[PDB]
Design a protein around this motif. Sequence first.
Motif, short mmCIF file in Angstrom:
data_model
loop_
_atom_site.label_atom_id
_atom_site.label_comp_id
_atom_site.label_asym_id
_atom_site.label_seq_id
_atom_site.Cartn_x
_atom_site.Cartn_y
_atom_site.Cartn_z
N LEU A 60 -0.40 5.05 -0.40
CA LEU A 60 -1.53 4.86 0.68
C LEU A 60 -1.33 5.53 1.92
O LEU A 60 -2.01 6.17 2.54
CB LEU A 60 -2.17 3.61 0.67
N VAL A 69 -6.25 -0.12 -5.13
CA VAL A 69 -5.66 1.23 -4.44
C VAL A 69 -5.91 2.43 -5.24
O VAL A 69 -6.52 3.50 -4.77
CB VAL A 69 -3.91 1.13 -4.16
N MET A 109 1.05 -1.22 -0.16
CA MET A 109 -0.19 0.07 0.06
C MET A 109 0.91 1.26 -0.07
O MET A 109 0.50 2.11 -0.77
CB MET A 109 -0.86 0.03 1.20
N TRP A 132 -5.32 2.46 6.46
CA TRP A 132 -5.45 1.52 5.28
C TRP A 132 -5.46 0.06 5.65
O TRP A 132 -6.28 -0.70 5.39
CB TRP A 132 -4.59 1.98 4.28
#
Length: 129
Positions: A17, A92, A12, A28
């Motif tokens: 993220l 994502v 991520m 996340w």
Amino acid sequence: KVFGRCELAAAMKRHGLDNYRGYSLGNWVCAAKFESNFNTQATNRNTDGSTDYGILQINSRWWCNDGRTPGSRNLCNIPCSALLSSDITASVNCAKKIVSDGNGMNAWVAWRNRCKGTDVQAWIRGCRL
């Protein structure tokens, strides 16, 4: 595949993220586990020919198309199967368009019910970071 808290963390993180719209990485990973334990192929059928796919359960009546729904907008403008391959780059990529309209992560019913209010930034810790 099925992920490992840590293993998914850094993925991520390489996909931007960490912090995006003031949500730290931690946030996340946590929505991840309570959406599908970190299971990519995971789909779930709601009541009205509605379906949530993969890692974060992006639902089909709003974000992607799986050819079938009377509503079906494709805001993320992609094919739901993009969402069921271990290549996380469609989940994502889409998440960030989700996050970006109103409700932030409060749009992931399990993030607002299981990690909102907690010590999120722990989810990320020990995963070599």
